[PDB]
Ligand binder design. Structure first.
Ligand SMILES: *[C@@H]1O[C@H](CO)[C@@H](O[C@@H]2O[C@H](CO)[C@@H](O)[C@H](O)[C@H]2NC(C)=O)[C@H](O)[C@H]1NC(C)=O
Ligand SMILES: *[C@@H]1O[C@H](CO)[C@@H](O[C@@H]2O[C@H](CO)[C@@H](O)[C@H](O)[C@H]2NC(C)=O)[C@H](O)[C@H]1NC(C)=O
Ligand SMILES: *[C@@H]1O[C@H](CO)[C@@H](O)[C@H](O)[C@H]1NC(C)=O
Ligand SMILES: *[C@@H]1O[C@H](CO)[C@@H](O)[C@H](O)[C@H]1NC(C)=O
Ligand SMILES: [Ca+2]
Ligand SMILES: [Ca+2]
Ligand SMILES: [Ca+2]
Ligand SMILES: [Ca+2]
Ligand SMILES: [Cu+2]
Ligand SMILES: [Cu+2]
Lengths: 704, 699
């Protein structure tokens, strides 16, 4: 079955679904890029992933491929009871039908306040701030901040305190040219209430300046002019790090460069990457972000899907913005906020780079150039090696080379790096880095219970990062069990001197039967060897397994006591294994960010006391850390040590190490000529086999 | 300025001629020595005292005498001792002092002494000439017996059960040609007693065949010939993996190759690496293994010393050899058992490669070619990046390049990989990988409580690996404190709507004042942020710090209840911080392997309830994992996912990211020509002309 079922929609296919929806949605249908709250609107159109039954029927058993469909989110603002609605639209490329799956999926209409804040909304909010509200305090603002074209606004987190609220705290910052404005908070923060569908009716519920609450910007300017406010002059320009990214040092000799001496050893065709060892499909959800499907090692499928589900950032702090802030980044979109990869910085210069197409908050499809990069990377390490000077004189090794796919999501200040790396041993590593700029507060007072001073007038606010992954392993077929292997010591008499005691080392295997048993809380310890496995077995008779191996420094999760916690229930777990249902496609939702108190998807609902003894299983992995900012996070947070993710590793899945059969392996005996070419491939790189290519002239995918 | 350089070949011959002429005649070469002889076991660099060394490197003083330390086996006397002697000054030695007593308070029992290469050879003459033909009937019928040329022997762990013992279990294995013999256990294990100083007197305390215990080989042969022993014939050759390393698949298009477009960006002179950012010295102890001294980031020193102290492997199993085995690898030697790096496999092809000289168990100095490699590696990752489509249109980042130093020690089956990697952010990563062959048993019976079947007739025995590192951080001078930062949530009324509650996130700092508070047991949780710091502060007024960040999947340590456990008490700790003394230079010792019950050094003695508030500190980091072998370990165990170690990371130590001032940084704005060469270095013969391949050879 040779189709590309998992490919993100092309631009024709988006135009096609747009044309279709235009014609059929009633007249009065506004473009989303200019829409007001009471308008109608196509928010999003993206690929609707196919149901698994049908997909595998095609891929494995040759049946016809399932209708390729799209899913549009529609803001219905023009009516007595405004709803959000999800509609499926197919088949592609010539759509002929549309049904409204909203009720059928979340049992009821979608409250209109759950909708993401549109780009027009943010723009209206700024008209309200800069034109109507902020000149009421123009005296204060001359005095402190060089006064509304030099200042600039930034959003927060959940918007309110209570299901249905839509009130956001907004920070104010100097509009720094050519570097991060995120460091130069001016101390002013405005709780805006924009729940109403008429922007004229929008209020400013509270105000916060340098330590103090006020009821309005008027009453702040009353108190300023009455001489009753100690105001702090915050510089406006400066130099190095806090103000720049451009290094003052001039370029020196060049760093090392990697090249393929005789052509590449893989190919990308559409959504499908293929190599001597690995074959897989890849994509970005608009909200979910990265994903790969149909991963096959030497022709056998290991995983149906691996895909980011959510990223979280829980903050604390002095100011109301920082202590309210819980970003659920799916609500903005890890795909929407993807950004071009800059060649030679984000991936190796000779990597192959791929575009990504999308239709969000517009009516034309746009394209993000160089959104993904795929490459083979020599790691420096040997994968494996042994040198025998003992009894027999030989050497046998293999340098590890690895296959890689990378996107980067720039969510305001943060640049998330998402890596999916494919080892020649049959292992799959998922990785998640955070760089970019820190979300900062204005430095004031009881600092230190809440973070570190990091520049003049700048607090680095404490926060946690957590991220969720879905790992739908299909280990040797759909029917899988989970096993927990570990270890134990048993006091025993030494057999041949019973007078003497010895501490006896033993393996421990428990087969986990129920969802509740394989759900592991953050804080609880957890089996050293945990793997999903098969009815089937390898040559020596052990169940065929793939083994999850985590890499987390997890923060304490937001306590359960909180009304908000439900919107990201998944943070509380390290790992959970679950019966994989069509009704349960995802862990979070775009709709949880703006109403986590009545969550649109609640992940703890999935762990519900069913068997996981021989069913189609799906593993859910949380990974993250705590981050007390510090001075070396200026200008940017750095990758080193901040890799988090997991390994999927073979455990009695094969009969031997597949890399035994590698084309790149190296062997020689003591009695051989190790530097003769017929014995050793490495002895010909010099003779002839050299010659770095001419390079492609540099290009860049641009900006908005 | 080369205080820390391992001894040259001249300097070894020099100490060896000096020791010859002054040790009494009757002084035998160690390679040939019998237990009752006298013997120079080792001569290696004696590291200088820290007061004096710093005096020299910082304050201009003259250098401390360059000295050597020789271990001498004094077997020819009424009470035989082992003795460590300092010998100086170099390169013209004129003195020699016996530090043994002054260091471990008394003589060194002769049984603590490492099993020499001649001892292993004598044990094999006993085994194959006197003992094994007593059972040539069984061995014809099970293992193709020829008079012992087809079989082969391998050591175990501590030797005996009790302080003073010297009785070693030995497994038998087919002598596979050109691939690891370690997978072909024949089922036979002999407890040999070799304590005596007269090899004629050596006994065979016990025997183990195929699940059952016998008192000698004669008795097993009685029981065999009586038809009373079910014998199975174990094949002798075979194909693929379990029997080979050579891939059957022909070489394909070549893998990616890294080269330096306009020459290297570092240099190696003797023991000293130098680069644009980093400057350090490097070496191997003979027993302790890798180490680096005088690490200087942009000229300021961060660490005095980082050094491997010990590697440990605890096993379990069906058979006596497996369940008795706890290898303390220092007792063999991580430096001795270092092996040449094979260019293009163990390190980048274009890396620079350095020799190592040693003098152990001989009288001439030998050399291990290509023992170290140093290289710059482009990682493919960015060190950092931001892309702004928001309010202002710009891009600013930096691909991470890294500097690396690597040695590999092959201890029998196991190939340990030791890495020291130097990030341009000011971080140092220490890494430890294990590859090579698994140590295997013969498959019989109750398997499964004890490991996995992994080939025909081969059990992969469960085991833990752990390793110990000494990290002598000198954060902004000698006086350091340690701090433990972490996090907490505090229920609080929302200020601006107090009828609602909010879970308020807060940092948590405690300054650890006592050694007991900064020693962290395996099992117990540990502060998310834990760093050594200074009196001094950065611009913003935070204490200047380096943070330790571990990477361990610890095995359960050997229980305390065990008589053996003191010989590696560092296994029970994740991390310990400690007043740094000259009487406490190391964590284990070469003498612990052969007598852990009366440990020659016991690490828990260092954690002794002193203050660590503003003292010269040292951190000790344990790292390791559990290994239940599995089919994908044949023919070798793979590196993937098996990296363990730690990061040493700036924490308010600088005023900003030093990489901000990087030469290889990249910046451009929306309104610029991103592909014009004057804006972007990335927008600009017959490249690598490669050295013809060579190899360091074998014994
Ligand atoms: C959500 O909104 C849409 C319209 O704004 C509702 O769908 C319409 O329903 C009426 C009568 O029920 C039909 O005659 C229209 O033609 C429908 N339009 C479409 C395209 O679906 C919808 O029922 C509302 N859903 C809920 C449950 O609130
Ligand atoms: C270990 O043995 C050595 C020699 O077998 C001892 O060293 C000698 O000590 C005698 C006096 O007891 C001196 O006269 C010799 O000149 C010494 N030789 C050297 C090179 O030291 C040593 O005393 C023994 N160590 C202990 C602690 O017993
Ligand atoms: C912010 O700064 C940039 C200059 O790079 C400018 O183009 C933009 O118009 C400024 N003003 C605001 C309020 O966004
Ligand atoms: C073992 O086999 C090797 C080569 O395969 C041989 O050279 C050696 O001498 C043999 N005998 C022993 C016991 O070492
Ligand atoms: Ca369920
Ligand atoms: Ca599955
Ligand atoms: Ca102490
Ligand atoms: Ca120190
Ligand atoms: Cu962060
Ligand atoms: Cu192991």
């Amino acid at each position: 079955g040779q189709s590309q079922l998992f490919a993100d929609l092309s631009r024709e296919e988006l135009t096609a679904v747009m044309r279709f929806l235009t014609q059929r949605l009633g007249p009065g249908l506004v473009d989303a890029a200019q829409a007001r709250p009471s308008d109608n609107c196509v928010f999003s159109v993206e690929l609707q992933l196919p149901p698994k039954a049908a997909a595998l029927a095609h891929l494995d058993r040759g049946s016809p491929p399932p209708a390729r469909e799209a899913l549009a989110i529609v803001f219905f603002g023009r009516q007595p009871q405004p709803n959000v609605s999800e509609l499926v639209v197919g088949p592609l490329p010539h759509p002929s039908y549309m049904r409204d799956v909203t009720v059928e999926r979340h049992g009821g209409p979608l409250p209109y306040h759950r909708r993401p804040v549109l780009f027009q909304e943010y723009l209206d909010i700024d008209q309200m701030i800069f034109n109507r509200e902020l000149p009421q305090a123009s005296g204060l603002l001359h005095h402190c901040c060089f006064y509304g074209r030099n200042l600039v606004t930034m959003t927060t987190a959940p918007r309110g305190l209570q299901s249905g609220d839509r009130a956001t705290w907004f920070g104010l910052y100097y509009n720094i040219s050519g570097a991060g404005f995120f460091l130069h908070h001016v101390g002013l923060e405005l709780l805006v209430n924009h729940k109403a569908l008429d922007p004229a009716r929008w209020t400013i519920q509270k105000v916060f300046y340098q330590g103090r609450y006020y009821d309005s910007l008027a009453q702040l300017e009353a108190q300023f002019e009455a001489g009753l406010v100690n105001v702090v002059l915050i510089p406006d320009n400066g130099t190095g790090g806090s103000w720049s990214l451009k290094s003052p040092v001039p370029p020196g000799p060049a760093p090392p460069l990697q090249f393929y001496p005789q052509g590449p050893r893989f190919s990308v065709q559409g959504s499908r990457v293929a190599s001597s060892l690995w074959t897989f499909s890849f994509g970005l959800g608009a909200f979910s972000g990265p994903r790969i499907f149909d991963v096959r090692f030497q022709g056998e499928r290991l995983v149906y899907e691996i895909s980011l589900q959510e990223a979280l950032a829980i903050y604390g702090g002095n100011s109301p913005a920082a202590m309210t802030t819980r970003y659920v980044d799916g609500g903005f979109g890890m795909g929407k906020y993807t950004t071009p990869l800059t060649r030679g910085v984000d991936c190796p210069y000779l990597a192959t780079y791929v575009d990504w197409h999308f239709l969000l908050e517009s009516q034309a499809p746009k394209t993000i150039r160089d959104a993904f990069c795929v490459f083979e990377q020599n790691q420096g390490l040997p994968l494996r090696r042994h040198h025998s000077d003992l009894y027999s004189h030989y050497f046998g090794g293999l340098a590890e080379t690895v296959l890689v796919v990378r996107s980067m999501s720039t969510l305001l200040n943060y640049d998330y790096v998402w890596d999916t790396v494919f080892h020649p041993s049959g292992a799959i590593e998922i990785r998640f880095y955070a760089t970019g700029y820190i979300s900062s507060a204005f430095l004031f007072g009881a600092t230190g219970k809440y973070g570190n001073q990091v520049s003049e007038h700048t607090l680095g606010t404490v926060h946690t990062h957590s991220a969720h992954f879905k790992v739908d392993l299909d280990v040797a077929g759909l029917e899988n069990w989970v096993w927990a292997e570990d270890m134990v010591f048993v006091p025993m008499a030494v057999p041949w001197s019973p007078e003497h005691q010895l501490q006896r080392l033993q393996v421990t295997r428990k087969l986990l039967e129920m969802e509740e048993q394989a759900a592991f809380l953050v804080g609880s310890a957890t089996p050293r060897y945990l793997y999903l496995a098969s009815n089937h077995s390898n040559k020596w008779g052990h169940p065929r397994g793939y083994r999850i191996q985590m890499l987390s420094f997890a923060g304490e999760p937001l306590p359960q006591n909180s009304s908000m916690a439900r919107g990201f229930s998944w943070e509380r777990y390290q790992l959970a294994v679950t019966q994989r249902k069509e009704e349960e496609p995802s862990s979070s939702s775009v709709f949880n960010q703006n109403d986590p108190w009545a969550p649109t998807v609640d992940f703890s609902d999935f762990i519900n006391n069913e068997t996981i003894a021989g069913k189609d299983l799906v593993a859910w992995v949380t990974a993250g850390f705590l981050h007390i900012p510090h001075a070396e996070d200026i200008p940017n947070t750095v990758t080193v040590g901040n890799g988090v993710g997991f390994f999927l590793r073979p455990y009695n899945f094969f009969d031997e190490d597949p890399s035994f059969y590698s084309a790149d392996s190296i062997y020689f005996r003591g009695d051989q000529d190790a530097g003769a070419c017929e014995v050793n491939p490495l002895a010909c790189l010099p003779q002839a086999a050299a010659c770095a290519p001419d390079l492609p002239a540099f290009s860049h995918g641009g900006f908005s």
